[PDB]
Amino acid sequence: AEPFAKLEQDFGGSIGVYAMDTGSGATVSYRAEERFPLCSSFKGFLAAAVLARSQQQAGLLDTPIRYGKNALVPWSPISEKYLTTGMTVAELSAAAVQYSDNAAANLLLKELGGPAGLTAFMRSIGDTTFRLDRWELELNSAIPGDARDTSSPRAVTESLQKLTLGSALAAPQRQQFVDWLKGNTTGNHRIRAAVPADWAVGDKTGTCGVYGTANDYAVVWPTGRAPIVLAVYTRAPNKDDKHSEAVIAAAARLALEGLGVN
Numbered sequence: 319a320e321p322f323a324k325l326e327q328d329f330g331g332s333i334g335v336y337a338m339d340t341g342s343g344a345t346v347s348y349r350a351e352e353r354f355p356l357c358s359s360f361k362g363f364l365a366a367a368v369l370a371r372s373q374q375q376a377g378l379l380d381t382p383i384r385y386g387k388n389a390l391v392p393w394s395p396i397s398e399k400y401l402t403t404g405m406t407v408a409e410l411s412a413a414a415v416q417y418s419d420n421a422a423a424n425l426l427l428k429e430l431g432g433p434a435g436l437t438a439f440m441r442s443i444g445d446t447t448f449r450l451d452r453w454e455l456e457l458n459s460a461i462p463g464d465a466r467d468t469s470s471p472r473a474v475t476e477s478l479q480k481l482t483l484g485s486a487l488a489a490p491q492r493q494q495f496v497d498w499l500k501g502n503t504t505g506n507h508r509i510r511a512a513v514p515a516d517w518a519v520g521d522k523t524g525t526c527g528v529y530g531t532a533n534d535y536a537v538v539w540p541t542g543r544a545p546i547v548l549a550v551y552t553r554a555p556n557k558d559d560k561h562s563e564a565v566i567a568a569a570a571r572l573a574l575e576g577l578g579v580n
């Protein structure tokens with residue numbers, strides 16, 4: 319734990335890490351059961367919830383979703399770009415996961431019954447820690463001591479494992495979820511930066527923009543070996559504290575090293 323302690327002291331905040339090697343059964347934990355803000359990392363689980371619903375509702379993924387300028391909140395690059403084209407549930411899901419599109423996230427939350435709807439999905443797969451309470455962009459406030467819109471690194475990792483590798487999703491939906499995570503564009507300097515270039519990685523990042531609060535979770539497939547699942551979350555005491563991608567990458571390296579994975 320000393321390397322993690324040194325890392326968060328250099329960073330000037332708190333770091334939460336949980337990692338599991340699904341081959342060896344080994345785990346690494348540091349503040350793994352503390353709460354950290356989700357920021358955009360909830361958007362991965364949001365896409366999973368959509369996929370789960372699509373198992374029972376034919377045509378859900380291809381359903382056109384109506385939105386205009388009014389729905390476009392800051393950082394909606396894809397939904398703004400394709401406003402004229404039109405977007406479906408599936409396209410919004412890809413946008414939320416891979417570009418962290420905020421309007422897409424809100425539109426999908428609405429289809430699922432809001433933050434409460436997504437929280438109930440996570441409950442249904444056995445996640446008692448996850449809570450989403452607000453919409454974009456209020457959910458990014460990341461106030462120290464505030465449990466709203468938080469989870470723990472361990473719960474995040476366990477739920478991610480259930481959805482990508484376990485049986486929480488039917489096989490086709492599981493693979494679609496994996497493919498969306500693999501295609502994420504926002505995580506190249508976080509967990510992926512700690513991983514050898516020929517290992518397959520799927521991830522979703524989060525960046526609140528305040529209180530040094532940012533994160534990443536991932537499934538990593540070492541070549542020819544069983545996958546690793548891990549979560550790295552950070553926060554800091556003051557509103558204007560900067561988050562650090564290098565710190566997330568470093569924490570992921572420490573996690574991999576702790577599992578004895580090279």
Ligand SMILES: *[B@@]1([O])O[C]([C]C([O])=O)[C]=[C][C][C]1[N]C(=O)[C]C1=[C][C]=[C]S1
Nearest residue numbers: 357358393418458504523524525526527
């Ligand atoms: B969110 O957390 O996702 C991040 C990108 C990421 O995946 O790390 C950035 C924009 C959408 C979400 N964040 C916010 O809405 C607050 C903002 C932080 C920077 C610009 S907006």
